[PDB]
Amino acid sequence: SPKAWDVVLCISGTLVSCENALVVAIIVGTPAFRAPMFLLVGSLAVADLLAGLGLVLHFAAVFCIGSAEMSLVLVGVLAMAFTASIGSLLAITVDRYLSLYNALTYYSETTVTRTYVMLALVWGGALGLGLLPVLAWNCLDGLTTCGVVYPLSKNHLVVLAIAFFMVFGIMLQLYAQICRIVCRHAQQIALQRHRKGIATLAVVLGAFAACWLPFTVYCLLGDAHSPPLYTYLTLLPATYNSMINPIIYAFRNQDVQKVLWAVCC
Template identity: 65%
Template structure:
């Protein structure tokens, strides 16, 4: 009897993936005899490619521009680098899952993805802390102590992310016992639970910091408006815009990551794989949106981008280049 080999999704336990490939043929179209490709994996690979290209632009701009060495730009560069590696990990996982199938490659690529997304979320928290400190200590913020503190934050978050990414390779995986697998193979249920709880704690801290930032911004705007009554309307509009920007940042982050975080906390490997893909895909969108929110809206980065691309700066951009950045 001839057996036709199937290529299963690399996120799922092996036996379960084969059973699902047979029972859910509507989700896995056949490209040629014996070859199965999950369309969800194709979408994730496409997202990874877009993430890589978009964030590579940000990394190159910051690395190429000596003027972008302030703490804020170092943190934005860290975020872009983390998202870039996450995109590379998603693309590499697809390639290895369908072209070079081995347990070692799964451990490496999933470890890279976990480490990259952990560094991405950590960088978002670091940016939030930096924005809070820049407002709370406005007079003494631009000092050598701030630069040192920024480097310490970067070393800690990347060190923690690398350690988390190495855990599957060092034996913290479910390859020996498929029943302990989480919704993301080869992470165990305990691994996923710890990561989910850590994310929720970081989100709670970011929420608290953004609330404090809103209070500081509104208090400063109110004080200025009392001193200059004729500017009250202008400051009201500026403050409302700043608070709206913070709400968009936090809302986007929660909308992208919260579904997968909550799902991985309550689900295990027995749940239908479509739920895993449906919650994981929005999480990757956060890495697509991050450059737009944190990098491309920044006027200094816009200026550097124009210099790199065509060696010119639009007049309206050059006039605003030294204006304060968005909250």
């Protein structure tokens, strides 16, 4: 039977897929909502849905299906999905910054060509990074160091983890600039008379780090023969980011919330 802490993967994947598929169905399915911001939100939702589905399939592959060769394909799918999700978060942040910094000209179709470039640069990088789990020196024969996450070699995992910090720094910078603009506006509005901005930033830029840091730190520091409990214990924070991204980027929007209520009500 699947040992302890195995059910957490399955339930987390199911929960991620449940909410992200809904976001996918609304944004991509319903008419309109083809604006570049909504395209980058739909890409994020698709990536998170792929990650959840990969987790669910991996749990089935662990005991039920029991196929050893299916595990590598599912791990590649999971790596691709997580890479695409983080790339979509970066793509959304850079889109917000570019809408604030080209506010007047942001409404041009130079953005749709950019949204498509980002959607195709985020998914090509995800595919390239998720191709490694098959061939390309990933411990299929055991010659290269492995074990930190058995279906992935330590080198590829460390590359993914370093790319995570590369994305995180750029996100911090972009949101710092956005906060500069927010403060510029806030000081102006108050003067005409007689904090929601920082509070929302604490979630937007804080939950991502608090969710993904533990797994990344474990990957950097974890040895090949580290106890298996650590892989699971640090995987729940990582999977949590995928079940709050719809809440942050999709639920808050007034129009998306309106369509969601119409479907639910």
